[PDB]
Design a protein around this ligand. Structure first.
Ligand SMILES: Fc1ccccc1CNC1CCOCC1
Ligand SMILES: [Zn+2]
Length: 140
């Protein structure tokens, strides 16, 4: 689990979105595993605006933050998980590292701020849904 809190937006994995998220929907995209809902309180996070390929991510199933190198966001085949069938996921970055289903929502961060959240795992990789292209998260 986990979210990004930027402005009056809450960014969550689409598959973990609650009824309250869907009732306060701003934007969602199944292909990216993202959903954004509106918040009452302002959040603490800053979104990275950059093309970094190095950062640090939180792994709940290890209680640890790991430094990783990661691929640029691309359209990637993802094998079946407990929460999606085998399918193509867009705007996905991969790194070598540990990820289980419950790790989804952990933040990946670089020197510029939040890059994305954990969205995929298995076979010794961790996949992250990028948010750095969602420039509208920084306004309104
Ligand atoms: F790293 C740990 C070590 C022991 C217990 C718990 C943690 C994880 N701390 C969280 C805090 C909220 O943001 C994500 C990381
Ligand atoms: Zn960066």
């Amino acid at each position: 689990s986990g979210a990004i809190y930027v402005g009056n937006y809450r960014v969550v994995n689409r598959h973990l979105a609650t009824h309250n998220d869907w009732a306060n929907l701003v934007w969602e995209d199944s292909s990216r595993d993202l959903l954004v809902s509106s918040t009452t309180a302002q959040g603490c996070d800053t979104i990275a605006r950059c093309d970094c390929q190095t950062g640090v991510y939180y792994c709940s199933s290890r209680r640890k933050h790991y430094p990783v190198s990661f691929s640029k966001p691309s359209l990637i085949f993802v094998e079946a998980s407990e929460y999606y069938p085998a399918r193509y996921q867009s705007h996905l970055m991969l790194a070598v590292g540990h990820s289980e289903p419950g790790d989804c929502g952990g933040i990946l961060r670089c020197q510029h701020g939040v890059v994305g959240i954990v969205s995929t795992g298995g076979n010794g990789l961790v996949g992250f849904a990028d948010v750095r292209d969602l420039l509208w998260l920084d306004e309104e």
